[model samples]
Target: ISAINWNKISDDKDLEVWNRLTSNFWLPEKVPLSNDIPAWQTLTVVEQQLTMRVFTGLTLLDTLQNVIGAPSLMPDALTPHEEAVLSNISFMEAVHARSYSSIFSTLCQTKDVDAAYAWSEENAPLQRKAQIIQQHYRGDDPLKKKIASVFLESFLFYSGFWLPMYFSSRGKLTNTADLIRLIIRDEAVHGYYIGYKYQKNMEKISLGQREELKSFAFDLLLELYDNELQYTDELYAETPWADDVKAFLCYNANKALMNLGYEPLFPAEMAEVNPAILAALS
Candidate 1:
């Protein structure tokens, strides 16, 4: 895996954008200086918003790693190029987490943002489900499981990462938009890799397995997106950037289904939703 020559296929537009983005969007030096100001006062409003942006990035890096690590239960039967792509994505995610943590500590006055690695460990429910899929269920009849995992990841990526990018892209935070754009580049690469692997394994999957996995994915996605909405609500109530975050989460939940190229087949009850407020509903 280490010897794989990625440059053969390195012409990917996504990779090109990702490489350029690192230079353009890095944090400034002397961030979060120790002034006698309060923790939230250490930065301007925009800076604080950027800090929360980094926080979400930190969370997303952990989510991506969990998805990747969960599926590594299989050997690298992937083509050489595919394997190299995965390697690049995994390594980049680690780097993103590091950069986010460095900035997070500066703003918050403490390193309480446990690195993405630590976050992954604490997210036990996700880990337990992944363990079941990888260890107990990835057998000859894995088609259903494979598809289910694909859709589950799709929802997670859409809600957790892409939605924020979409919001930022709409000029919600012009300064931070570039950063989210970079993360989106990496995420697009990851989504492609996962889709490739799923397609490769799909031929071997059984109908029963496929149906079961689809059910699993839909069930999990409904819960995951709703939980995210609740989390976002709490965030909005406390943070200055609440409105943007709320719109970001809700828009992405709806856009997530649209992005998948699927006509919404799931029932309204199963749809990823933002808790309703009377004014917003009207």
Candidate 2:
């Protein structure tokens, strides 16, 4: 029998951790109870909804960083640089999730935030992306698959980090805001990695695959932005603090983009969002 050639494996530490985490991801959503302390009770139903929505996005980020960054565990492989980027991005996801958990826990005064982790994967916006990845993997072209994966990553980085931070600032959720800052910094790095890899993959792709990737990306971006708008509406409707919720969500989303030195990805749709918050940023 041929001995297993373990030495043939890529030994990047980041990829190693990523593989370990991805193997541990769960699919179904989980829900935490609302019957806790004063702070949590003080939170309106809308606040609860927004909080949950943010947590859901955070967990999805955690899941993707794990899954995409660690493809080398099977017959698949990533370049050494790709592996490092994925690993760094994974760490950023963990930080983002942890920050959300902190706010949820401090308000609830309990440690049962796993339900937040569980709830996010089951939500509609996230599930659609999940299905897209699942279906794409069945196709023939390798480049198409990688491009889709990066696009999804890019979408998550924007929706999860940018949108939430904007809203958190207006709500005076200092704890959440502080965490958002860290998450934003990490996302900047993650976004750069995705951009770099997408370009790298494009070079190896056939002309047909490249066009397909661009077409798919453009359509998917439109859908994703539309979904975000709906998500924003539902979130605000669910919250008791509608103005604060809407303002903060839109602000954080826009603010996150400005920090990245890019225009808001959906300016025409996000026209109502104020630019004053951005003017204050250094």
Candidate 3:
């Protein structure tokens, strides 16, 4: 009986989770970026460059999550309900990628958009982090893959989210912020769903194995943290916002830890987010 039994749900909780996800369905087209055109032009050169870097990095991550990371786990899903939810996650990832394109189409020239994608490909930090996450995704162990997906969905993407939210709270790039708000809402659900799966699966492992997984998660997060710091420096060193970006990164990392029922990897002081932006997200 290797086949999935859709008619007899093995886990009613998974079906409930699927229902919650499906009920919040959204489309990128619904978020029109038309109003952002002039606002984008109003940004300083540094803001423009930083925004593009964040957008490009995010789009690349979403592309990987949609095409490789999410689908890789479907074959191993324990039940049809879980598989369906994972499929929805993959589809939403694609939607996020398209949402970024929608923003770019309104604000950038085609050549510039191509250049941003190319920049993402060449960026050392982005490539390094993606390669590391991809390694876990390709591993034979299902738990490792789920952990990587959670890290990617919950932690890695938050830094990119900071820019739009920051500018939006200050009354800049309002339309872009609106689009990102939708994406963030969806990502919060993705993080929670995947974290729930990870938590449930952890119960099936031995204590020693869970400890080992904990160690592995912390090490992976620390490395990614360092890489993100270097990446932020490279992108924002000229501006004063780099510190705030690091703070946001740490804050999200802590949130990811708590979501997985682990203590924060950093001190509470390190996790301070901009108050207004936090309120906006709430």
Candidate 4:
């Protein structure tokens, strides 16, 4: 019988990721989601709507990561241990998705919760982004799938993530922000591990293939960024935070590139998000 040996490691990185992920194990149930009621009560109708809308947007991507993205990589795993690491990432994404549900259960009306999910399903740019990534996930090209997966993990979630962090900066729904924090921590590794594996595979390929992958990676970011810009506007138009959200996207998009062992596609100036958001991130 073929079995994985955790006792002996083929790659220390996989073991490191596995150990860290398992140690970081969390359940959304543990958070006092109701602690945010005082904060939730202070929001205007639009403010509460924005919170739920952006949050459910996050739920969609986390749903993707759990059901499809992480598992999609396992068939091409370089080591059995890497497959195990990917599996761990998949389950944690389920945790991330459920975290949003727990937030709604505590802080929102069922009517609002239903509408937020409905909006996510109908959102144009979001659907396009999902389709774009899903196409890559379902494709036969290994490195391409990794690029798509890392972009989703590292960059795609930030526009919605910024909402929670931005609110946390103002002391609203701070406990809900706590949940998004755990999801972010989980993605930090999921993004890095997928990108590191891509970088590892790149080392063995030819210059021509390497150059092509470079093109694919950057182009994919551009595509996703375009979709994200539209989605950000749709979600943020009722408010004035679109530009700041774009700034956060630049910062995150650069990190997405760096995770793939490349230089930042976004420049230094565009990378400056509010320092308060930075504090929330930490």
* lDDT values, one for every candidate: 0.46, 0.49, 0.84, 0.92
lDDT per residue, candidate 3, 180-266, as tens digits? 888888788787777778888898889999999999889888999999898888877778888898999999898787777788887
Residue pairs with backbone atoms closer than 3 Å in model 1 (clashes)? 143-205, 144-209, 144-210
Tell me the tens digit of each residue's lDDT in model 4 across 74-176.
9989998999888889999998998888989898999999999999899999899989999999999999999999899999999999998999999898998
Global local distance difference test of model 3: 0.84
Report the lDDT tens digits of candidate 1 across residue range 164-189: 34334333333233444455555544
Output the number of the lDDT-best candidate.
4
Off by over 4 Å in 3: 1-8
Candidates sorted by lDDT, descending order? 4, 3, 2, 1
TM-score, candidate number 4: 0.98
Model 2 bad stretches (over 4 Å): 1-43, 68-78, 109-122, 137-141, 157-164, 239-272, 276-282
Determine which window of 10 residues in candidate 3 has minimal summed lDDT: 1-10
RMSD for each of the candidates: 7.8, 7.9, 1.8, 0.8
Best by TM-score: 4
Give the TM-scores of the predictions, in the order they appear. 0.56, 0.62, 0.94, 0.98
- Residue-wise lDDT of candidate 2 within 128-206, one digit each (tens)? 6565654555566554455445444444444445444555445444344445555554544444444444555467768
Q: How much is the lDDT of residue 281 in candidate 1?
A: 21
